Design a protein around this ligand. Sequence first.
Ligand SMILES: [Zn+2]
Ligand SMILES: [Zn+2]
Length: 52
Amino acid sequence: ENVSQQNCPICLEDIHTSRVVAHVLPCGHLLHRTCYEEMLKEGYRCPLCMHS
Ligand SMILES: [Zn+2]
Ligand SMILES: [Zn+2]
């Protein structure tokens, strides 16, 4: 399984290490701008913490 290539669990979309487009969460996770709003809206436990 291609786990070496990251994905956005916030909405099952694509994601990459480049944080110029992807906003950095203060816990070190990346998500596209809109998804930063979506996630921060909930303030829920960051699922990305399971994958690194
Ligand atoms: Zn997303
Ligand atoms: Zn985290």
